[PDB]
Design a protein around this motif. Structure first.
Motif, mmCIF file in Angstrom:
data_model
loop_
_atom_site.group_PDB
_atom_site.id
_atom_site.type_symbol
_atom_site.label_atom_id
_atom_site.label_comp_id
_atom_site.label_asym_id
_atom_site.label_seq_id
_atom_site.Cartn_x
_atom_site.Cartn_y
_atom_site.Cartn_z
ATOM 1 N N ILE A 184 0.863 -1.185 0.000
ATOM 2 C CA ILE A 184 0.000 0.000 0.000
ATOM 3 C C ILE A 184 0.896 1.230 0.000
ATOM 4 O O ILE A 184 1.599 1.479 0.982
ATOM 5 C CB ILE A 184 -0.943 0.043 1.217
ATOM 6 N N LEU A 185 0.860 2.012 -1.078
ATOM 7 C CA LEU A 185 1.598 3.271 -1.074
ATOM 8 C C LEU A 185 1.046 4.206 -0.007
ATOM 9 O O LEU A 185 -0.167 4.361 0.146
ATOM 10 C CB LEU A 185 1.516 3.944 -2.450
ATOM 11 N N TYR A 186 1.952 4.856 0.735
ATOM 12 C CA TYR A 186 1.491 5.787 1.766
ATOM 13 C C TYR A 186 0.726 6.953 1.158
ATOM 14 O O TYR A 186 -0.186 7.504 1.792
ATOM 15 C CB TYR A 186 2.683 6.315 2.561
ATOM 16 N N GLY A 211 11.925 -0.388 -9.982
ATOM 17 C CA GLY A 211 10.856 0.042 -10.859
ATOM 18 C C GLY A 211 9.848 0.902 -10.116
ATOM 19 O O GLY A 211 9.823 0.929 -8.887
ATOM 20 N N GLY A 212 9.034 1.638 -10.875
ATOM 21 C CA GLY A 212 8.052 2.481 -10.211
ATOM 22 C C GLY A 212 8.700 3.676 -9.527
ATOM 23 O O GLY A 212 9.746 4.169 -9.956
ATOM 24 N N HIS A 213 8.091 4.129 -8.425
ATOM 25 C CA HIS A 213 8.534 5.369 -7.785
ATOM 26 C C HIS A 213 9.825 5.200 -6.993
ATOM 27 O O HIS A 213 10.033 4.205 -6.285
ATOM 28 C CB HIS A 213 7.434 5.930 -6.884
ATOM 29 N N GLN A 214 10.701 6.199 -7.120
ATOM 30 C CA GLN A 214 12.000 6.213 -6.463
ATOM 31 C C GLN A 214 11.926 6.949 -5.130
ATOM 32 O O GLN A 214 11.175 7.913 -4.968
ATOM 33 C CB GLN A 214 13.046 6.875 -7.367
HETATM 34 CL CL LIG Z 1 5.802 2.617 -6.768
#
Ligand SMILES: [Cl-]
Ligand SMILES: Cc1cc2nc3c(=O)[nH]c(=O)nc-3n(C[C@H](O)[C@H](O)[C@H](O)COP(=O)(O)O)c2cc1C
Ligand code: SF4
Length: 366
Positions: free
Chosen positions: A103-105, A183-186
């Motif tokens: 779950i992304l914050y 991958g995705g957000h850094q």
């Molecule tokens: Cl991400």
């Protein structure tokens, strides 16, 4: 088929033991759902179900309201009913082997989705895209569930442990250190994403050292880990396990079937670092909506799913040129023209699509 018995050791995270010290990293939207995470867990690694955009599951079979073919608001974008179905279907495959929920914050309704994930049977919650200082507030009625922040620095480890301990008399069960090849957000400022200071082999010892103060909380290394040689490197630097996603993005069981078509074709030059409405740099493929932005024919922006708080209901999506909810959902639905596609830095090395079973044997034998 012969495979030498592994010399990797089982990994315990809170009350939960996985047979191999390997997480399949969560991948949204609809990339790591029941077929991928269930099979990973069946093979003895941690399968991780992404809880983001579950309203898209089975082409919005489980939402209460659809607007413009998109799940309406966060209530339907993060669909409790869909999340329950994904976990239930995963359990048919993996039984009591542990599963995580990612779950992304940054999401809207974060606390509700955390509780939904616990109620759906998750063993572990994994959260990045922010500093999740109040994660135990939402987990306190499910004390068996282990909690794992994703961090990028020793500083973040210290802040989370201090603040969780002061306010909840609890500290994290593990930390994932996500390096700049992920991958995705850094977890780095854009200007820091191609700087050797922050390569994963430099971060892991610093985080492991900081973890000593708090009883050697297990450190899970992530980002650019390709094979057993890389696993052994990270373990020798003090990590207790690894999290890997791009290799699993290249397996048959991946729930986003488009990637089996797209990844074998992926050339290194088409791996980009782009802005995101979430507010962190994202590693993406130069295809789909990203090409449409270049051409000037990308979809108009209209916030229907209200997926993430940093976007402010379309403000940041209009600035960066795309809606991440719409784009990621389109990819799960197979839309090559307007989908948004993510990859780790190593995505160009995927040549053939293999099974999860074969991958886990490759990573663990010997
Ligand atoms: Cl991400
Ligand atoms: C396609 C794709 C989607 C991803 N989506 C998420 C996500 O939703 N949440 C998250 O915490 N990490 C996400 N990540 C990061 C992975 O969970 C993982 O930490 C990272 O990719 C590991 O590096 P590797 O891909 O080189 O193994 C994503 C990665 C990829 C490749
Ligand atoms: S406009 Fe922004 S908040 Fe709304 S669904 Fe798209 S990315 Fe999410």
């Amino acid at each position: 088929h012969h495979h030498m018995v592994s010399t990797l050791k089982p990994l315990k995270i809170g009350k939960h033991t996985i047979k191999f010290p390997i997480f399949q990293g969560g991948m949204g939207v609809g990339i790591s759902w029941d077929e991928l995470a269930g099979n990973v867990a069946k093979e003895g690694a941690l399968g991780v179900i992404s809880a983001v955009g579950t309203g898209y599951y089975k082409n919005m079979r489980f939402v209460e309201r659809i607007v413009a073919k998109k799940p309406f608001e966060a209530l339907n974008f993060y669909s409790k009913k869909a999340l329950n179905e994904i976990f239930a279907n995963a359990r048919k495959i993996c039984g009591n082997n542990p599963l995580g929920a990612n779950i992304l914050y940054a999401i809207n309704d974060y606390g509700r989705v955390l509780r939904d994930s616990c109620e759906a049977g998750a063993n572990i919650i994994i959260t990045g895209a922010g500093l999740p200082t109040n994660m135990p507030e939402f987990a306190k009625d499910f004390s068996d569930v282990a909690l794992i922040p994703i961090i990028s620095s020793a500083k973040a480890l210290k802040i989370l442990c201090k603040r969780w301990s002061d306010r909840y008399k609890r500290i994290p069960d593990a930390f994932i250190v996500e390096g700049p090849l992920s991958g995705g957000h850094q977890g780095f400022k854009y200007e820091d994403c191609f700087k050797e200071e922050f390569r994963l082999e430099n971060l892991v010892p610093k985080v492991v050292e900081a973890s000593k103060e708090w009883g050697n909380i297990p450190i899970i290394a992530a980002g650019g880990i390709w094979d057993r040689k890389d696993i052994d490197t990270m373990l020798s630097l003090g990590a207790s396990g690894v999290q890997m996603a791009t290799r699993f993005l290249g397996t048959k069981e991946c729930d986003a079937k488009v990637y089996a078509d797209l990844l074998p074709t992926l050339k290194k030059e088409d791996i980009l670092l782009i802005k995101s409405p979430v507010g962190y740099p994202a590693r993406a493929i130069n295809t789909g909506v990203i090409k449409r932005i270049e051409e000037g024919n990308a979809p108009k922006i209209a916030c229907v799913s209200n997926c993430v708080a940093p976007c402010n209901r379309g403000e940041e999506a209009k600035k960066v040129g795309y809606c991440i909810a719409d784009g990621l959902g389109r990819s799960y639905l197979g839309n090559r023209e307007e989908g948004l596609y993510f990859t780790g830095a190593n995505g160009y090395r995927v040549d053939k699509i293999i099974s999860v079973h074969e991958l886990i044997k490759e990573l663990t034998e010997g």
